[PDB]
Motif scaffolding. Structure first.
Motif, PDB file in Angstrom:
ATOM      1  N   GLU A   1       0.830  -1.197   0.000  1.00 52.92           N
ATOM      2  CA  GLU A   1       0.000   0.000   0.000  1.00 52.92           C
ATOM      3  C   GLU A   1       0.864   1.245   0.000  1.00 52.92           C
ATOM      4  O   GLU A   1       0.343   2.355  -0.032  1.00 52.92           O
ATOM      5  CB  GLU A   1      -0.918   0.030   1.215  1.00 52.92           C
ATOM      6  CG  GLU A   1      -0.711  -1.107   2.188  1.00 52.92           C
ATOM      7  CD  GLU A   1       0.378  -0.835   3.205  1.00 52.92           C
ATOM      8  OE1 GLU A   1       0.445   0.317   3.728  1.00 52.92           O
ATOM      9  OE2 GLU A   1       1.129  -1.798   3.503  1.00 52.92           O
ATOM     10  N   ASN A   2       2.182   1.065   0.034  1.00 50.95           N
ATOM     11  CA  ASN A   2       3.073   2.207   0.035  1.00 50.95           C
ATOM     12  C   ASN A   2       3.562   2.538  -1.342  1.00 50.95           C
ATOM     13  O   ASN A   2       4.518   3.265  -1.490  1.00 50.95           O
ATOM     14  CB  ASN A   2       4.236   1.971   0.984  1.00 50.95           C
ATOM     15  CG  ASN A   2       3.776   1.901   2.426  1.00 50.95           C
ATOM     16  OD1 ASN A   2       2.749   2.492   2.808  1.00 50.95           O
ATOM     17  ND2 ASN A   2       4.503   1.154   3.237  1.00 50.95           N
TER      18      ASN A   2
ATOM     19  N   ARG B   1       5.758   4.399  -7.357  1.00 48.05           N
ATOM     20  CA  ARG B   1       6.612   5.146  -6.464  1.00 48.05           C
ATOM     21  C   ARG B   1       6.191   4.798  -5.050  1.00 48.05           C
ATOM     22  O   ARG B   1       5.005   4.584  -4.770  1.00 48.05           O
ATOM     23  CB  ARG B   1       6.527   6.658  -6.720  1.00 48.05           C
ATOM     24  CG  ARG B   1       5.115   7.189  -6.969  1.00 48.05           C
ATOM     25  CD  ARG B   1       5.034   8.726  -6.942  1.00 48.05           C
ATOM     26  NE  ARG B   1       5.402   9.240  -5.624  1.00 48.05           N
ATOM     27  CZ  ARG B   1       4.566   9.359  -4.591  1.00 48.05           C
ATOM     28  NH1 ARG B   1       3.283   9.015  -4.707  1.00 48.05           N
ATOM     29  NH2 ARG B   1       5.035   9.776  -3.418  1.00 48.05           N
ATOM     30  N   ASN B   2       7.190   4.577  -4.209  1.00 49.54           N
ATOM     31  CA  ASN B   2       6.963   4.265  -2.814  1.00 49.54           C
ATOM     32  C   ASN B   2       6.491   5.617  -2.277  1.00 49.54           C
ATOM     33  O   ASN B   2       7.231   6.602  -2.271  1.00 49.54           O
ATOM     34  CB  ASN B   2       8.284   3.831  -2.177  1.00 49.54           C
ATOM     35  CG  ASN B   2       8.144   3.449  -0.729  1.00 49.54           C
ATOM     36  OD1 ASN B   2       7.403   4.055   0.023  1.00 49.54           O
ATOM     37  ND2 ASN B   2       8.891   2.455  -0.318  1.00 49.54           N
ATOM     38  N   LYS B   3       5.220   5.707  -1.939  1.00 53.10           N
ATOM     39  CA  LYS B   3       4.699   6.957  -1.460  1.00 53.10           C
ATOM     40  C   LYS B   3       5.453   7.464  -0.263  1.00 53.10           C
ATOM     41  O   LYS B   3       5.463   8.650  -0.003  1.00 53.10           O
ATOM     42  CB  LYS B   3       3.225   6.806  -1.135  1.00 53.10           C
ATOM     43  CG  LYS B   3       2.333   6.537  -2.340  1.00 53.10           C
ATOM     44  CD  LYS B   3       0.891   6.251  -1.893  1.00 53.10           C
ATOM     45  CE  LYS B   3       0.871   5.147  -0.824  1.00 53.10           C
ATOM     46  NZ  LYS B   3      -0.495   4.775  -0.368  1.00 53.10           N
ATOM     47  N   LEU B   4       6.119   6.573   0.448  1.00 52.41           N
ATOM     48  CA  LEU B   4       6.838   6.958   1.644  1.00 52.41           C
ATOM     49  C   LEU B   4       8.280   7.445   1.511  1.00 52.41           C
ATOM     50  O   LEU B   4       8.665   8.424   2.167  1.00 52.41           O
ATOM     51  CB  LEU B   4       6.763   5.823   2.660  1.00 52.41           C
ATOM     52  CG  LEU B   4       5.402   5.710   3.350  1.00 52.41           C
ATOM     53  CD1 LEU B   4       5.268   4.334   3.880  1.00 52.41           C
ATOM     54  CD2 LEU B   4       5.243   6.707   4.495  1.00 52.41           C
ATOM     55  N   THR B   5       9.083   6.765   0.692  1.00 57.15           N
ATOM     56  CA  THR B   5      10.477   7.127   0.524  1.00 57.15           C
ATOM     57  C   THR B   5      10.738   7.860  -0.788  1.00 57.15           C
ATOM     58  O   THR B   5      11.823   8.440  -0.987  1.00 57.15           O
ATOM     59  CB  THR B   5      11.363   5.872   0.548  1.00 57.15           C
ATOM     60  OG1 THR B   5      10.990   5.037  -0.555  1.00 57.15           O
ATOM     61  CG2 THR B   5      11.245   5.067   1.894  1.00 57.15           C
ATOM     62  N   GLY B   6       9.751   7.823  -1.685  1.00 55.58           N
ATOM     63  CA  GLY B   6       9.851   8.470  -2.996  1.00 55.58           C
ATOM     64  C   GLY B   6      10.457   7.643  -4.134  1.00 55.58           C
ATOM     65  O   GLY B   6      10.310   7.979  -5.296  1.00 55.58           O
ATOM     66  N   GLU B   7      11.083   6.530  -3.786  1.00 57.73           N
ATOM     67  CA  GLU B   7      11.751   5.612  -4.710  1.00 57.73           C
ATOM     68  C   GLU B   7      10.872   5.026  -5.811  1.00 57.73           C
ATOM     69  O   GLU B   7       9.885   4.351  -5.524  1.00 57.73           O
ATOM     70  CB  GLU B   7      12.363   4.481  -3.891  1.00 57.73           C
ATOM     71  CG  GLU B   7      13.036   3.377  -4.668  1.00 57.73           C
ATOM     72  CD  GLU B   7      13.351   2.180  -3.781  1.00 57.73           C
ATOM     73  OE1 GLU B   7      12.498   1.810  -2.926  1.00 57.73           O
ATOM     74  OE2 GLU B   7      14.454   1.616  -3.924  1.00 57.73           O
TER      75      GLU B   7
ATOM     76  N   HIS C   1       4.341 -11.015  -0.979  1.00 53.92           N
ATOM     77  CA  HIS C   1       3.558 -12.222  -0.978  1.00 53.92           C
ATOM     78  C   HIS C   1       2.212 -11.978  -0.391  1.00 53.92           C
ATOM     79  O   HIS C   1       2.104 -11.402   0.683  1.00 53.92           O
ATOM     80  CB  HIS C   1       4.237 -13.274  -0.105  1.00 53.92           C
ATOM     81  CG  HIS C   1       4.944 -14.343  -0.870  1.00 53.92           C
ATOM     82  ND1 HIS C   1       4.640 -14.650  -2.181  1.00 53.92           N
ATOM     83  CD2 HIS C   1       5.907 -15.215  -0.494  1.00 53.92           C
ATOM     84  CE1 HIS C   1       5.381 -15.670  -2.575  1.00 53.92           C
ATOM     85  NE2 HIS C   1       6.157 -16.032  -1.568  1.00 53.92           N
TER      86      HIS C   1
ATOM     87  N   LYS D   1      17.831 -12.951  -6.283  1.00 48.26           N
ATOM     88  CA  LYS D   1      18.071 -12.519  -4.933  1.00 48.26           C
ATOM     89  C   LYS D   1      19.471 -12.837  -4.387  1.00 48.26           C
ATOM     90  O   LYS D   1      19.774 -12.547  -3.249  1.00 48.26           O
ATOM     91  CB  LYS D   1      16.935 -12.944  -4.002  1.00 48.26           C
ATOM     92  CG  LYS D   1      16.895 -14.341  -3.536  1.00 48.26           C
ATOM     93  CD  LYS D   1      15.473 -14.591  -3.033  1.00 48.26           C
ATOM     94  CE  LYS D   1      15.010 -13.593  -1.942  1.00 48.26           C
ATOM     95  NZ  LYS D   1      15.435 -13.947  -0.534  1.00 48.26           N
TER      96      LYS D   1
ATOM     97  N   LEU E   1       1.561 -12.225  -6.217  1.00 49.60           N
ATOM     98  CA  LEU E   1       2.964 -12.164  -5.867  1.00 49.60           C
ATOM     99  C   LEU E   1       3.452 -10.923  -6.624  1.00 49.60           C
ATOM    100  O   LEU E   1       3.255 -10.825  -7.846  1.00 49.60           O
ATOM    101  CB  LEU E   1       3.636 -13.408  -6.441  1.00 49.60           C
ATOM    102  CG  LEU E   1       4.816 -14.155  -5.849  1.00 49.60           C
ATOM    103  CD1 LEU E   1       5.337 -15.093  -6.911  1.00 49.60           C
ATOM    104  CD2 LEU E   1       5.867 -13.213  -5.457  1.00 49.60           C
TER     105      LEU E   1
END
Ligand code: ATP
Ligand code: ATP
Ligand code: MN
Ligand code: MN
Lengths: 258, 298, 298, 258
Positions: C2-3, C22-28, C71, C56, C76
């Motif tokens: 949700e971010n 975009r990660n609403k939190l970090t901007g990435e 997950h 990975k 996924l």
């Protein structure tokens, strides 16, 4: 005293190595840098001053921040949000009475909302995987402080003052263990205030010698000497303070002759 | 979370709603402590923060296993190892017979060991009481509920004012002493030990002063001789009724010399003198410990 | 999950569609590859299992970063670092321009770094081509799409036949040789190298035989002298036209003596003598290598 | 392509320690036992033969299994569901042509459903954090074999035979790293077939010695010795095939002389 004091020290010494952030993570961070980081940590210092948070909380906040930024790419703009959330968490973990989120939102002066701060708090928890009991320079300084006779409050405030100057500068500090900075920070204080050095008692405990703690001490002394002209000055301000016996006002050794 | 079938409900309160669940794929039965985050107000509770960070840092057979933490946007369920029942229930069950001393020695032996582990890892439990201690069908008892626990630093600073459940609260707390340590947990455990033997709470205070007075009436009012400094603590009153110490055989009747010895040491006024988990473990009382199976009703 | 704020549809492939977000939190900014699985069908696809598991392990400035795997019970989400263009389009927009030698050399340098890293962690990419190499706005290029990738063994086993897009497929594979390995990726890179210079596919065949035939015409039909064993390979036919080996400087005219050498070693027939990524890093072609930063078109 | 052999060997040696399962997991495990596990791995050997899977897939399934069980408690009635999911994953990961999920549901003859097998697959994936590229005994054997002078296919297949035998029994092999077992399996094979011992070039490569391998060698020897009367017999009956040069029929050394 008699049983756990060592178990604990020993345990911390084990964890500090597990709690380390990537020493050069900033080079891999595309929009933020150690300077912005400094600006951020200094602000945090001011915040702790503001809400009178324990010094230990400041230390935890920076810990969680370096671990977060070591894993998550962050933009200069959200950088303070990572700070506010990191402080939030450190307060909940450390303080008897941590400021409510309203207070934490207020200090960012309308920069972020309460929901962002709260959403970042969960993110910092996911990333750090709930591992918040991080060892810090403060914890170790605290144990080391026991091995000082007589106990010189000025030496304590000075040591506190020194290892706090380290929180600001990722370069070079990020590459030392808390225990070592605690030591270098300790010896540097004892000497600066009372011409004495790292006690064998402490050497038998830590296994630190004035020459194994030398690299750190060498940096710590420069940092100390240039404190006056560092862009960041909240730690000097906070330490002119009466409950820190204006240790910032003190005169650092021109030399050590180690 | 779609893998857990909610079976019963258990310790629902404060934060938890604690259900008993089974993983529909493995068959494993867990104990789900659901925690409610304040998504638009307070955020993740400090209780959960300290509890989870410390529990996932305490791997020992006498500390409940936190198995997973399910991290949703609005909820946070702690998946723990399901242990049959708390010591408070086993005790009520044992009303009419009593927990056999050999099982008691065993239980207290295991607790002191788990506690010693917490203490050697700079963690204070601060809520030691029967209900927060769980047992299984084989003879094991584990420390549970770390919602009140806190990681300590050496030397100790000034921690949260009067914590611990009244009945198991140690005198330093009661008297408003400046700092507290691992010894507050030793007291609680001591009180638990007597409670297991006498089948009744040792000091059922109905208040902080009642609590103080029940302690005093039993152990005798402490003086500067028995606890150098009592007279000087924030909640100590020179108007305290100076009671006399009772013969320990009066205190915990079934207990033998060692039992009374080990107990007198887990109830020392002076915290600085109060036995440690590491030491208590050594104590003679334990010389012949085994690992009895309780007759469960599980 | 949700971010993240979706920002557009990027490039769909196999597992599902790829959004930009975009990660609403970090901007990435990131790329979200999605998978709905095959719930009451195949299950998690093998490509996604090889891709996520191998990807990975490969943490390198020159391999696209899988930041996370989200997950949920029915979906996924694979969260990748966001990269602006792929070489394919970049070259397309290099109209007139031509990728200047400095950037070709930089790019070739980075690719070898990232590919040598893959080979060192027993991973064959098996799908190198300009569509699969993503560039950023800072002068970096990174290998992508590890869907065809596979962890190899020492010695190698017979792996999936016919891998690699035709144009970039190595002669070993076309001759249906029993075992292929790391050299296959080095052939693809030699082709991309010639392609960055000439701006045109080196061996644009339409069938496998057309491909062999274009390969043979440019480097000559291999014989037992140049590739001990060619003539006994499964798909080697004695009827093959024997073309003389073209003078290498005519293969990629703009290239210098050094770049010719590297290319000749990358396009070496005998896979055993074909240069390694690891060893290509120390070639004189790269002695002046820098990190020219190209201005993107988006 | 030896150009990568040592980087890869060094990489695998590093990863084998990260995929190491909790060496004491069966004790803590509530309803299943070593014997049940031995029953499960044997069956998987059959499934591998049925679907003509690769040996590496066998080894991979088992690796996944031991790791799952190291953190997840499983009911005896639920153990084959784990085994099938791990086998399915191992298949998609390693096979050119893996069996369809319908084949896997068929082999757990009427027992489980496919939604069940699929949901377990997703769970084995969640528990194993997608870390499926695990180093196996076979991956090391395969490298060691390159130090034969000259190569002897009977030593090779025998080594494989024994390495697989170690899969059946968690007690004692759950405490040996794949590389160690691959070293024991190889030496004991070389010796049994050619009287030769752990090669010097492998000591350089691996750093392991006959004396580093003793503990495991002692165990592997007894296993080879008692093999004919082991409850499980799929591997013995499997290694009778010409494909493996019928090495299970070979007679083990009465002694090792170490
Ligand atoms: N592993 C467990 N198995 C069975 N029941 C458990 C387990 N852990 C906790 N419980 C149940 O919930 C009860 C409460 O202790 P727990 O720490 O779970 O707190 P809670 O009631 O959610 O909150 P609080 O911290 O206020 O007690 C236990 O006494 C027990 O009855
Ligand atoms: N990390 C990413 N950054 C930018 N764009 C991406 C990224 N991942 C995918 N895309 C875009 O989608 C197109 C398809 O490429 P990619 O090979 O990465 O995955 P896919 O096609 O969605 O799935 P598969 O792996 O099965 O091919 C690419 O050309 C790329 O431009
Ligand atoms: Mn409780
Ligand atoms: Mn692609």
């Amino acid at each position: 005293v008699p049983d756990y004091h060592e178990d604990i020290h020993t345990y911390l010494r084990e964890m500090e190595v597990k709690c380390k952030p990537k020493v050069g993570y900033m080079k891999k961070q595309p929009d933020i840098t150690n300077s912005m980081r400094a600006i951020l940590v200094d602000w945090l210092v001011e915040v702790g001053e503001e809400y009178k948070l324990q010094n230990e909380t400041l230390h935890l906040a920076v810990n969680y921040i370096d671990r977060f930024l070591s894993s998550m790419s962050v933009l200069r703009g959200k950088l303070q949000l990572v700070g506010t959330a990191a402080m939030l968490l450190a307060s909940k973990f450390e303080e008897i009475y941590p400021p409510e989120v309203a207070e934490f939102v207020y200090i960012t002066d309308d920069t972020y909302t309460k929901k962002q701060v709260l959403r970042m708090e969960h993110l910092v928890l996911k990333v750090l995987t709930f591992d918040l009991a991080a060892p810090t320079v403060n914890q170790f300084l605290t144990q080391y402080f026991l091995h000082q006779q007589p106990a010189n409050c000025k030496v304590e405030s000075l040591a506190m003052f020194l290892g706090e100057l380290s929180l600001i500068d990722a370069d070079p500090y990020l590459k030392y263990l808390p225990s070592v900075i605690a030591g270098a920070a300790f010896h540097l204080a004892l000497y600066t205030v009372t011409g004495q050095s790292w006690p064998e008692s402490l050497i038998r405990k830590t296994g630190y010698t004035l020459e194994s703690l030398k690299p750190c001490l060498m940096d710590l002394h420069q940092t100390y000497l240039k404190a006056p002209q560092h862009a960041q000055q909240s730690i000097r301000e906070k330490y002119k303070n009466s409950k820190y016996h204006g240790v910032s006002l003190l005169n650092p050794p021109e030399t050590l002759n180690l | 979370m779609e893998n857990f079938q909610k079976v019963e409900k258990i310790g629902e309160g404060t934060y938890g709603v604690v259900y008993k669940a089974r993983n529909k794929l493995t068959g494993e039965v867990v104990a789900l402590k659901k925690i409610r985050l304040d998504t638009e107000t307070e955020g993740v509770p400090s209780t959960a923060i300290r509890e989870i960070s410390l529990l996932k840092e305490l791997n020992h057979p006498n500390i409940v296993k936190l198995l997973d933490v399910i991290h949703t946007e609005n909820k946070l369920y702690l998946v723990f190892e399901f242990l049959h029942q708390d010591l408070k229930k086993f005790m009520d069950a044992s009303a009419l017979t009593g927990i056999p001393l050999p099982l008691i020695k065993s239980y207290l032996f295991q607790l002191l060991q788990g506690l010693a582990f917490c203490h050697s890892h700079r963690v204070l439990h601060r809520d030691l009481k029967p209900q927060n201690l769980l047992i299984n069908t084989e003879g094991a008892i584990k420390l549970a509920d770390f919602g009140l626990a806190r990681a300590f630093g050496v030397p100790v600073r000034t921690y949260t004012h009067e914590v611990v459940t009244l009945w198991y609260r140690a005198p330093e707390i009661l008297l408003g002493c400046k700092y507290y340590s691992t010894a507050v947990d030793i007291w609680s455990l001591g009180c638990i030990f007597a409670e297991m033997v006498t089948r009744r709470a040792l000091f059922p205070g109905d208040s902080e002063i009642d609590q103080l007075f029940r302690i005093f009436r039993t152990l005798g009012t402490p003086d500067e001789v028995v606890w150098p400094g009592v007279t000087s603590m924030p909640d100590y009153k020179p108007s305290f009724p100076k009671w006399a110490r009772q013969d320990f055989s009066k205190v915990v009747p079934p207990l033998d010399e060692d039992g009374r010895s080990l107990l007198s040491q887990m109830l020392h006024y002076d915290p600085n003198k109060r036995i440690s988990a590491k030491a208590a473990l050594a104590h003679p009382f334990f010389q012949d410990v085994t690992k009895p199976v309780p007759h469960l009703r599980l």
